[PDB]
Write a protein that binds this ligand. Sequence first.
Ligand SMILES: [Zn+2]
Ligand SMILES: [Zn+2]
Ligand SMILES: [Zn+2]
Length: 502
Amino acid sequence: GDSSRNKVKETLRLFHGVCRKILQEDEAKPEDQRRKGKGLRIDFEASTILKRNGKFLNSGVHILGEVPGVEVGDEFQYRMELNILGIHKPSQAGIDYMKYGKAKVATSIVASGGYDDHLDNSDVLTYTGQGGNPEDQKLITGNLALATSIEKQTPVRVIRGKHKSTHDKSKGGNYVYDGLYLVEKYWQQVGSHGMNVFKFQLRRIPGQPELSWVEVKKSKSKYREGLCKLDISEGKEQSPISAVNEIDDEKPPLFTYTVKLIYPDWCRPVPPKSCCCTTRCTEAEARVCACVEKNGGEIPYNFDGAIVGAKPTIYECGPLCKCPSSCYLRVTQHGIKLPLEIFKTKSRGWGVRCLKSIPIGSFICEYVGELLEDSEAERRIGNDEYLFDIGNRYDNSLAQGMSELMLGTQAGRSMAEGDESSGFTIDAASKGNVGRFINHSCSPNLYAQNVLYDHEDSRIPHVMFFAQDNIPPLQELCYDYNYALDQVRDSKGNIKQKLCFC
DNA sequence: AGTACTCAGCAGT
DNA sequence: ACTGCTGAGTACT
Ligand SMILES: [Zn+2]
Ligand SMILES: [Zn+2]
Ligand SMILES: [Zn+2]
């Protein structure tokens, strides 16, 4: 069950990983011969790659009721994700159905705003049938199945998609699994083609985790009476980070806010080698870029700014690089570009959330504090509580896997660990940014990535949090603990040891 | 093994 | 905004 949840999560992570890989390969090609712009569907190719390696879930079956591992509020960008998970099989069509006896009943529906659906209440939904749009709608296939579901009283999965404008700022939050509904009644009515249209009333089954749009709603409206401060950054951030509490009159804890890292006095100034590019640094350009070569001959970012894959170290263009700030190799240096707020949690003290959907691979924020040789946990105040041991270790198994999917080739297994000579740690107990409020979780939606701009000392990189899920709005932001690299978390979330190195 | 169907997702305008 | 186009997967002839 938990085991199921992790299979789903990792399946979606794999899928999007492949998507961004295909995308990076295309961005590496010159403007003129890029497949993007000329009818490229990364969703289809990613899909096909996963299906080839037997990575689909619930393949060859229809699920009625709850798909194991799929929870209310889960977000998708592509209709295709629903297919690989078995949530909804058709790539396009709104209605999915299956045999339930000799009759056919609806497994799942998609309300994307194609027809004039009414989703006005949290509780109840009016769903337009499907028929050519000029003939009257026929009561067959999907429409029939949704009708039969009424007598059979068999639940229906409801995914609502946000209205898709080709304005298309993003695909973040494109589909939300809203959950399980019963079909109550259906009628015929004239629909705006001048021909008759079917309509189905669905009622959400009680006792389900409540709808997310209802939570952006409860949250949204200005009054925000939970506000403790408008801007915890106190103007040091291009946008205010507000603090809210609806569980108390607790003010957030006191600290000096900082956006820049405090190095010690002894930590040598080490300027880094820079690139000479006139334009934005890409693999596409005829002229080679020193910072690209530094990243192993690949842009570790997509053009929208998403990290392509985790890496031991990511090199961004420095202050003495000659490229415009719009350079794709500038992402984490530009600072926070999401609406963040800190909030009181019943259980966990103080936490960080985002009030909009965060697409997978997105940059969140830096863990800013003052940097200390690990030797000095001598301080005594920030014990654990506002402390971040800078990650030294790495394992190439995941890259080995992504590699196997995309090329059929792996590098040999290798693992890295920082010498105990220098571990470094970031203390935010006294000074830090919003990153200091991020809590820890056994199932995180954030992971820490080391980036180097400013300097080349690889023992004191910047810690940049990225997103490893499509994160629903208001979902709490959390990252996991460092780990020993001999130990890994299995399906049930228990610590085991990695299989033989070989 | 072939065809009809589509609540996507692009791309040109 | 309004078009037009190529579609994956699945259900049926
Ligand atoms: Zn650059
Ligand atoms: Zn360059
Ligand atoms: Zn550079």
